């Protein structure tokens, strides 16, 4: 049925109790629990509606079960109403769903109040009732939804609900591009450094580690993350979910920490350049990246596979047990423990050592007025690094801290978006740390093959 699909993209789906536009406790696919501000009253109504102790959380099956009931209860409410029934009978299948939509939203006795537009609706004068419905509180309260229902009423088509498919297939396109950019980018980088011995420097050994983490992310994390979002489900095991999210945290931790290692690498190459090649050896270099991945392993696979990350609230417990749920619920402890160890500590180090580099550049910039190309290009690169890095990961790791401190603040969608903003940073890294003339030559050679 189309009325079922229509309401699914009008009410969405939330397995936990939330507040709708009017501030009423709602759950599932737009099922009003109570018009009272009492959470306990809402939780009691949910328990009665489902038939078990819910803790404010239901399942997807229980959501569609309540959904089908609410739709049926709306149709019955129309047929029993003596002012709505002649209109419903008059309307076609598509326009019927539009009427069911309003009743689903405002109730049978609430829709019946629209005397003027109900008349114009039965008279089949669509364009009249179209602008007549716009002059109501229902339109002012929910502008985006009312326009979709009114459009369906005056056209008799589903063109108003055709946007959802466009944004999905469009998002599927841009996700494919991201995956392609990350893989093509980092493969080209790792290949170039490996094949050509001239590029194998101490600094560029760190970039290989970075490009490796970024590569695995573009191969393992991002593609399966795109499928999880587009299909709106997880078509793999609970094992594969716990394995996939491990690679997520592992690669992110490795990627960000390696960015920090590069930063400290340049710190010694700028502040104490005469000791640089003595402090940082090829041997010490691989020792550092060993520690990076060793650490990253202890923040990803160890806490996750041992179920130390797991939260304790009901929605998490249901998610962990559901073979089609792969939402990343974490306890407050692991969240802030993994956040500081995979971002904030690298951040404060990165800001410190780059502040010092900023000083050393400005200091030399004061000595001579012209021909300061080295310091100018340093400052410019310095901006691009801290710019794209913080702009990509800081918002995510801010809301990552917030959502485990005060819930009902950070939405699911915005956690995903800001996390994917961090994902594309893996695609940006080959555009930042591989700009050298020797990289450009190595790239024009591999692509000319």
């Amino acid at each position, epitope marked *: 049925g189309n009325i079922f699909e229509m309401l699914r993209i009008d009410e969405g789906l939330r397995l936990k109790i939330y507040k709708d536009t009017e501030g009423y406790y709602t759950i599932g696919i737009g099922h009003l629990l109570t018009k009272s501000p009492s959470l306990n009253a809402a939780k009691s109504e949910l328990d009665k509606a489902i038939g078990r102790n819910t803790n404010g959380v239901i399942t997807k099956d229980e959501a569609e079960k309540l959904f089908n009931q609410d739709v049926d209860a709306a149709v019955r409410g129309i047929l029993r109403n003596a002012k709505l029934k002649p209109v419903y009978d008059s309307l076609d299948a598509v326009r019927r769903a539009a009427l069911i939509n309003m009743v689903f939203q405002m109730g049978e006795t609430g829709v019946a109040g629209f005397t003027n537009s109900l008349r114009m609706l039965q008279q089949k004068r669509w364009d009249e009732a179209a602008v007549n419905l716009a002059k109501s509180r229902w339109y002012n309260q929910t502008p985006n939804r009312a326009k979709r229902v009114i459009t369906t009423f005056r056209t008799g088509t589903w063109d108003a609900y055709a946007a959802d498919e466009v944004w999905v297939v469009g998002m599927g396109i841009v996700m494919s591009l991201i995956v392609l950019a990350i893989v093509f980018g980092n493969v080209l980088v790792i290949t170039a450094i490996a094949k050509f011995e001239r590029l194998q*420097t101490v600094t560029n050994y760190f970039i290989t580690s970075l490009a490796c983490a970024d590569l695995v992310m573009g191969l393992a994390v991002v593609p399966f993350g795109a499928a999880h979002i587009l299909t709106k489900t997880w078509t793999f095991g609970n094992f594969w979910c716990e394995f996939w999210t491990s690679i997520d945290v592992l690669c992110v931790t490795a990627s960000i920490e390696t960015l920090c290692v590069i930063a400290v690498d340049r710190y010694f190459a*700028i502040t104490s350049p005469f000791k640089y090649q003595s402090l940082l050896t090829k041997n010490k270099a691989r020792v550092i990246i060993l520690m990076v991945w060793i650490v990253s392993g202890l923040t990803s696979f160890l806490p996750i596979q041992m179920h130390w990350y797991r939260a304790t609230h009901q929605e998490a417990i249901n998610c962990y047990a559901e073979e089609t749920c792969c939402d990343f619920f974490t306890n407050q402890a692991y969240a802030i423990a993994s956040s500081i160890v995979s971002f904030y500590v690298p951040l404060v180090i990165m800001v410190f050592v780059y502040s010092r580099v900023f000083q050393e550049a400005k200091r030399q910039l004061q*000595k*001579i007025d012209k021909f300061c190309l*080295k310091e100018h290009k*340093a400052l410019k690169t310095l901006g691009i*690094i801290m710019g794209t890095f913080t702009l990509c990961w800081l918002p995510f790791f801010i809301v990552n801290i917030v959502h485990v401190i005060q819930d009902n603040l950070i939405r699911k969608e915005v956690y995903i978006l800001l996390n994917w903003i961090g994902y594309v940073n893996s695609g940006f890294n080959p555009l930042i740390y591989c*700009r*050298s003339p*020797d990289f450009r030559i190595a790239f024009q050679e591999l692509l000319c093959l």
Partner: nanobody
Amino acid sequence: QVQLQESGGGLVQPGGSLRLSCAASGFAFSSYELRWYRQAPGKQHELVAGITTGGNTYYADSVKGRFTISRDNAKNTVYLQMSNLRPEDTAVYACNANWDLLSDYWGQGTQVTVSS
């Protein structure tokens, strides 16, 4: 990998002259900015001379007029001809090629000691 080897340092009478050579191998030399740095014992390192890709040379106030830096792209070598040397010029002189923040390569550095 990238390599910068200095040669031409050592001992020299005060007022004497030395010529530092810096051989480069492993990168696109011609499109790199070259500088000569030095570091006296127990002191902060300082810039001696520098030459751009265009050929623009710039020097420190203390060695201006005495030292002369030049570059040979055909041989991937940058030189630092330094005359009228002084006991203050006694330091470890290092070669440095640079493109951006990450493409910054240094030499091992050669010791120049000036005394009578």
